[PDB]
Amino acid sequence: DLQRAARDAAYSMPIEEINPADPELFRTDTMWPYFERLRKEDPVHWGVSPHEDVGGYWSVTKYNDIMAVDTNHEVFSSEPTIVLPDPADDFTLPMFIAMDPPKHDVQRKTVQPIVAPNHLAYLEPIIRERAGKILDDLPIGEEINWVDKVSIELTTMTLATLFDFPWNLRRQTLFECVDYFMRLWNEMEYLGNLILLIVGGNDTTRNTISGSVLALHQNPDQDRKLRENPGLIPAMVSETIRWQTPLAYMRRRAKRDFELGGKTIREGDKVAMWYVSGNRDEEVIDRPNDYWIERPRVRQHLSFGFGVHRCVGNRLAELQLKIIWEEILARFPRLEVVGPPRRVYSSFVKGYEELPVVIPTRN
């Protein structure tokens, strides 16, 4: 089908021309063969994009390589940004994800409370109630865009719930403040930090909900295993977060000359940590291109990163999705995917815009 044509085109073409950051590979879902080939023949790979903002950059495609970059913030700087294209000046709000340790470590401490375990324990029964209602309102035996009707709805609910937003003069004035800045974003320390949490927990949680549904459509063996024993939901949530890799990569910038995969990454070079490709390294992961809930070491995966920038919201994400999926199995014995998805046109955000689903029956 498509996956074969791309395998042909990828192994055929001259390896230096492989530009993994092409967003048209990620939307057509044809990017796996390119990454597989690099993983073998050119693990640390110099490529060039047609786009200026990007230009030439290193693709780090293997698990251990990626870790060596992620964990080493002395050499590999999260400044000035963490996406490939260099910063404009549309949005100058201070993101601590694109800040380096001393300054970075301080700002992070300001958000660790809001995602602390005793606060998660407060939120759980609320998230569950609220998820329960969103799901009780879905239509039965009628086709819906799962992304708009379920993933966005549930994702919006969680973020609202996290910050006790509306869903009174100061509570209301803060929401409005936040809504303002989030709109501008799409088109000042503590405010950025709060905007980062929202941005960093929106499309990632969204896409993992849409992801799960497709994964189970593609593996009816593993749907059965899940509905038979619901104790496997946290496993399934892990394996989806690997399988789907909502943030495909994160970039860094070398502060000195550095040797990785026997190649000299030069000072000031851009380095793309391809988590999407590292999550499928045969060398570290058994049966990497298999949706496998009961795979051993289900938790060992790159999708939340490693090192000082490791997703601060990882346990909230896993608790959100756990509750969501408890509540989904309770209500719907089938989530039949009736048409092919329509994927986001980005090599950063690996996600869905459309996912046609029918829910036949309830309870």
Ligand code: HEM
């Ligand atoms: C499935 C869900 C999620 C995935 C896959 C994900 C993935 C990531 C990744 C890959 C990073 C960068 C790691 C690195 O550079 O080494 C990151 C950072 C971050 N994520 Fe998430 N994330 C998820 C959910 C969330 C949630 C729910 C929140 C907040 C409620 C959140 C907030 C953040 C923040 C604030 C950062 C920056 C951390 C720092 O700079 O120290 N994420 N996330």
